[PDB]
Write a protein that binds this DNA or RNA. Structure first.
Ligand SMILES: *OP(=O)(O)OC[C@H]1O[C@@H](n2cnc3c(N)ncnc32)[C@H](O)[C@@H]1O
Ligand code: NA
Length: 645
DNA sequence: GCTGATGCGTC
DNA sequence: GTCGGAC
DNA sequence: GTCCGAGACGCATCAGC
């Protein structure tokens, strides 16, 4: 028999044979170490196609030898507990995880934290960790499904003292870990596998696997490499087609619990016959590509006619109306928010004609003040309860701004152009002021008329404009292009928006790709009244890899053991390295918000809360400025007031 | 019962 | 959400 | 262009008090 120890499993080898090169036998549980070894081979390469090939080899062995374990192996590869709509949450972050490592090793929680921060990866701490659990019985090797079952067991633990119950399961896993298993179990619980391979690549590997090694064969499978009879060119074309069948199906039914059973019983080629878009099953939403100016929009949309629509500052709400009356609402991430919007459920009868029997609407939920009849800031929207039983208790009303229709009366509109989908939206749905409204739109290509429209959108309390083609490449097929729309935000424009010069007062050690250097920084404004620096926000994006290495080499010389007395951070995350205030960086953000932690400009707008920056990004260093010339807290307050108008 | 840390989702 | 890097 | 992996702040949960 095949007694290959999993420690030697190599899914990246040339001429991989699904049966003979697997490190487990027919009918045996897929060892979790087989998955870990696959992760190792995947993270040491940078080409996606090489990663897909490697994962595909594992999946072919699983199909050939252990079909029941295909589903848990996929979820482990994605670092997911299940379909997004089932609302499964581990309830385990770095806090719970690091606490579990400390007890499993006898170390102080502070020591494990420091080491994890230094290495930038909890997985490397759990692997180099000396285990204190002097167990008197060697545990069996972990299995892929067994580890997946324990992860779901962790999720289901709720109530008081549940944390200690979660830790016990985690500790039990680590005591049974061998080789690199502990590394990836810790990474999975942290939520940071660091593979460089995610949803799109897992689908590509899956489609390739079931195409090369069709499931459902009599063992041993007579057909283990269905590409052998094809030329390289025909093989590539054939695999791309099968990949699209899986991608487009998944985009309409992103639920492996529904796809994999069909896949194993009927094959990939017949998958669309048994799995298709349906109300009650969320689908992947169309996303937008950032554009930096109106000129870029015409370039990307040369020739093709397009429309512009207000980009409202709310939350995406995918509204499903099933044949029968059942209504469900999903988020951008396929999460079920039905219980959050009882006021929207009771509103559906008002927005549709008597002929509408089912639909899937793409809308933006926006906080709405019925007294003043005006859009309220996104911040007000986030104060709604996540499970509102009685609509009579809701305090923040919402108005739905519909901008697309994906399904109508039992028929999918995914292959229709926007012009038709938009037309079906207007002909079949009814507007109500402040409750359900079509997105304010404009059809033109006159640059002058677009800039005016962009301005009016900002005056009407919007982030900017969405630009979408009407007929050329204007379908809702996410597998063909997920970012088929263009977003033009006010703060994308060169020289427009909020730009601040802030003092660097602290550095945070980086994680993953940022390990061994600073991944983020603590910034502050200058309060000229008390002559103190007040933390305003953290910063962790906007610089190249080369700029960030220079920030590391430069700021390392400013590291202090204790903070200066004139530096107030109050409730902000204490930096790993206090920095002598000196460096002044130019920062851009989308908005300013009243913060519950940051002290910047406290007392200049509200007595208790300071001000922070929404989505800050690094622009450039200001070598011509010292901390005393940084943006003042007074200027921060003035900036915040210019918003509230 | 209350507070604050933690987890996770929204942008 | 933003951003940059490797392909 | 694709794909992937490197902020503020709100509710909800829960450990510690
Ligand atoms: O920045 P981003 O990529 O999340 O932007 C896309 C999001 O913008 C919201 N939005 C608001 N108004 C619209 C219209 N008219 N069309 C499309 N999207 C819109 C959505 O929430 C979307 O996810
Ligand atoms: Na590169």
């Amino acid at each position: 028999s095949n007694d290959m120890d999993p420690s030697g499993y190599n899914p990246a080898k040339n001429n991989y044979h699904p049966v003979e090169d697997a490190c487990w036998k027919p009918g045996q549980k897929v060892p979790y170490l087989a998955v870990a070894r696959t992760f190792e081979k995947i993270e040491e390469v940078s080409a996606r196609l090489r990663m897909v090939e490697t994962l595909s080899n594992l999946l072919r062995s699983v199909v050939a030898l252990s079909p029941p374990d295909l589903l848990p192996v996929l979820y482990l590869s994605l670092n997911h507990l299940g379909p997004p709509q089932q609302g499964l949450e581990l309830g385990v972050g770095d806090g719970v995880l690091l606490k579990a490592v400390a007890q499993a090793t006898g170390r102080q929680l502070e020591s494990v934290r420091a080491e994890a921060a230094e290495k930038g990866d909890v997985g490397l701490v759990a692997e180099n960790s000396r285990s204190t659990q002097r167990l008197m019985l060697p545990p069996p090797p972990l299995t892929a499904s067994g580890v997946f079952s324990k992860f779901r067991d962790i999720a289901r633990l709720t109530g008081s003292a549940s944390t200690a119950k979660k830790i016990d399961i985690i500790k039990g896993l680590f005591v049974a870990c061998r080789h690199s298993e502990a590394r990836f179990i810790a990474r999975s619980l942290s939520g940071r596998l660091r593979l460089g391979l995610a949803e799109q690549s897992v689908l590509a590997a899956l489609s390739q696997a079931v195409s090369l090694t069709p499931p459902g064969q009599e063992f041993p499978p007579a057909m283990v490499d269905a590409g052998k009879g094809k030329t390289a060119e025909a093989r590539k074309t054939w695999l791309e087609e099968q990949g699209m069948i899986l991608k487009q199906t998944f985009c309409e039914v992103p639920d492996l619990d529904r796809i994999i059973p069909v896949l194993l019983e009927h094959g990939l080629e017949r998958l669309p016959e048994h799995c298709k878009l349906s109300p009650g099953i969320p689908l992947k939403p169309m996303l937008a590509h950032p554009t930096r100016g109106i000129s870029e929009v015409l370039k990307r949309f040369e020739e093709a006619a397009f429309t512009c629509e207000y980009k409202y500052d709310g939350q995406r709400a995918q509204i499903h109306a099933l044949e029968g009356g059942e209504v469900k609402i999903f988020s951008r991430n396929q999460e079920d928010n039905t219980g959050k919007y009882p006021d929207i459920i009771s509103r559906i009868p008002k927005i549709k004609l008597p002929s509408v029997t089912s639909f899937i609407l793409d809308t933006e939920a926006v906080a709405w003040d019925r007294e003043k009849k005006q859009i309220q800031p996104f911040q007000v929207l986030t104060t709604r309860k996540r499970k509102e039983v009685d609509a009579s208790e809701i305090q923040v009303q919402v108005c739905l701004y519909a901008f697309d229709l994906i399904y109508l009366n039992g028929e999918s509109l995914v292959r229709e152009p926007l012009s038709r989908r938009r037309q079906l939206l207007r002909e079949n749905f009814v507007e109500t002021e402040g409750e359900f409204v079509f997105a304010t739109s404009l059809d033109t290509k006159d640059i002058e008329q677009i800039a005016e429209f962009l301005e009016q959108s900002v005056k009407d309390s919007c982030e900017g404009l969405m630009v979408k083609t009407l007929d050329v490449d204007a379908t809702y097929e996410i597998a063909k292009r997920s970012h088929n729309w263009l977003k033009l935000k006010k703060d994308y424009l060169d020289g427009v928006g909020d730009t601040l010069d802030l003092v660097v007062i602290g550095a945070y050690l980086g994680r993953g790709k940022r390990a061994g250097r600073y991944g983020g920084f603590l910034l502050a404004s200058y309060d000229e009244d008390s002559e103190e620096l007040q933390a305003i926000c953290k910063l962790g994006t906007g610089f190249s890899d080369e700029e960030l290495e220079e920030h590391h080499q430069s700021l390392k010389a400013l590291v202090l053991p204790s903070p200066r007395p004139y530096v107030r951070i109050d409730g902000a995350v204490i930096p790993d390295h206090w920095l002598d205030p000196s460096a002044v960086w130019e920062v851009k953000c989308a908005d300013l918000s009243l913060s519950p932690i940051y002290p910047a400009a406290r007392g200049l707008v509200d007595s208790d809360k300071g001000i922070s920056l929404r989505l800050p990004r690094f622009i450039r260093v200001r070598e011509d400025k010292q901390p005393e010339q940084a943006t003042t807290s007074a200027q921060v307050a003035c900036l915040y007031r210019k918003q509230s108008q």
